[PDB]
């Protein structure tokens with residue numbers, strides 16, 4: 209007699225608002241806009257450190273802590289630091305890097321439409337999943353929850369055994385970036 | 398949809414750049430953060446750990462291009478004294 | 485709400501307040517006054 | 521002193537009118553100076569000028585940079 | 596056979612071919628060496 | 636004819652046209668990484684347009700042939 213389907217809020221085991229994702233998208237976009245329009249390369253790298261943070265939080269917020277923390281440790285931690293070193297030691301006259309940006313507005317208009325109209329069709333349904341709105345539903349499992357692993361233990365269970373060839377190539381790419389970058393910069397002895 | 402927009406930002410960094418070889422360095426990394434970010438969000442959708450791992454190896458190759466890229470840019474600056482493009 | 489959220493906001497409030505004592509109570513003189 | 525108050529705004533509408541019956545600098549053997557000859561002096565401290573704001577370089581000095589090494593590869 | 600509206604199809608080529616050439620002029624302005632502006 | 640239209644409509648005409656054509660195309664190659672990047676993206680867009688709109692193959696050749704003529708024309 210009464211409606212069989214019943215919808216009610218969750219009092220304690222709740223979760224996060226999906227509103228935060230829409231905020232973190234906006235700032236990531238806003239931060240990214242300032243990267244490619246800023247006059248000073250120091251400032252653009254700062255807007256890059258901001259973008260890497262917003263994307264890192266976006267991922268932590270949706271459950272991907274190890275890689276979201278890996279982005280923090282790797283990009284903001286170390287790559288942008290190397291960028292800051294070089295950019296704070298190279299002499300930069302901030303007017304020789306400034307080009308007439310107003311000319312390229314029409315080409316910005318043109319290439320924005322063409323790329324956006326094509327690539328968006330390529331994306332899968334799950335990524336563009338976000339008036340009757342579809343709700344995603346989840347339920348518990350017991351056989352699959354016996355000894356659950358964090359994402360880093362799951363990556364580790366296969367990173368060094370089944371897909372270990374990927375580790376070999378990466379070890380050699382990092383090793384080449386060591387030898388090659390040392391040999392093209394330093395004066396021997 | 399955020400992944401595609403952030404890809405455009407990297408593209409548009411190549412559209413608006415006549416003088417910054419540093420912004421060309423930057424926009425390549427914005428483009429890499431789009432593609433890694435897209436792989437990751439689809440991995441959460443399909444319950445696959447290989448998408449997570451593929452992101453990890455993209456992050457490691459991305460840092461290595463920064464070392465090679467900033468190393469070569471140092472070698473150029475030593476003999477040039479300027480990163481500027483006369484135009 | 486979660487605990488991690490209330491914790492960052494709390495620290496954020498304290499970090500703002502020490503600005504407030506400085507900007508409210510500390511004096512403020514308007515006068516704020518090439519090689520390779 | 522916030523620089524704006526009720527009476528100070530009214531001061532904005534008036535213009536200075538020089539009293540013609542009153543003595544001036546000349547009567548004291550003095551010459552006033554204008555403010556245009558002094559702005560550079562009293563505003564020079566308020567001039568943010570770093571290596572960034574410098575003009576784009578010329579071709580002659582770009583050549584001068586090729587006689588220097590701009591990196592110390594042994595330090 | 597099935598006749599085709601020549602005027603309609605003719606415009607399509609003008610927009611298709613002309614549309615591409617509009618993108619070429621966009622390249623020309625972006626690579627302009629002076630402050631020529633967007634409406635150039 | 637022999638020393639005229641046969642050579643103007645032939646080896647001497649082709650010589651004069653092609654040398655001018657190639658001087659113009661090589662006037663594009665400026666060793667400016669900023670300009671090269673735009674050219675790669677331009678060449679990327681045309682590939683996407685071609686092989687997504689299902690444009691007529693003839694539409695492409697008109698563009699290609701029309702381009703070659705503009706490189707024949709100077710200034």
Ligand SMILES: CCCCCCCCCCCCO[C@@H]1O[C@H](CO)[C@@H](O[C@H]2O[C@H](CO)[C@@H](O)[C@H](O)[C@H]2O)[C@H](O)[C@H]1O
Pocket residue numbers: 504507508509510511512513514521522523
């Ligand atoms: C972020 C949270 C919101 C903001 C909270 C903090 C608000 C800060 C502003 C209010 C307090 C201002 O603090 C006060 O500023 C004025 C103006 O600069 C200073 O005033 C000083 O310079 C002015 C210049 O016009 C003089 O006329 C004045 O006689 C002199 O005392 C005071 O020395 C300073 O103590």
Ligand SMILES: CCCCCCCCCCCCO[C@@H]1O[C@H](CO)[C@@H](O[C@H]2O[C@H](CO)[C@@H](O)[C@H](O)[C@H]2O)[C@H](O)[C@H]1O
Pocket residue numbers: 645646647650
């Ligand atoms: C159906 C159409 C015909 C089919 C294809 C026919 C193509 C034949 C055209 C070849 C054009 C001549 O090719 C070009 O000629 C000039 C001379 O004119 C040569 O130029 C040479 O001769 C000149 C003579 O003063 C000297 O400066 C020098 O010995 C050398 O530069 C070039 O080395 C050659 O590249």
Ligand SMILES: CCCCCCCCCCCCO[C@@H]1O[C@H](CO)[C@@H](O[C@H]2O[C@H](CO)[C@@H](O)[C@H](O)[C@H]2O)[C@H](O)[C@H]1O
Pocket residue numbers: 641643644645646648649650651652653
């Ligand atoms: C018996 C017939 C034998 C036929 C042999 C094979 C013919 C080969 C076909 C193409 C020959 C080249 O054809 C020739 O093109 C060149 C440009 O490249 C033209 O060369 C010239 O064009 C105009 C004049 O018309 C000039 O202002 C221009 O400066 C110049 O490029 C010739 O006017 C044209 O006749």
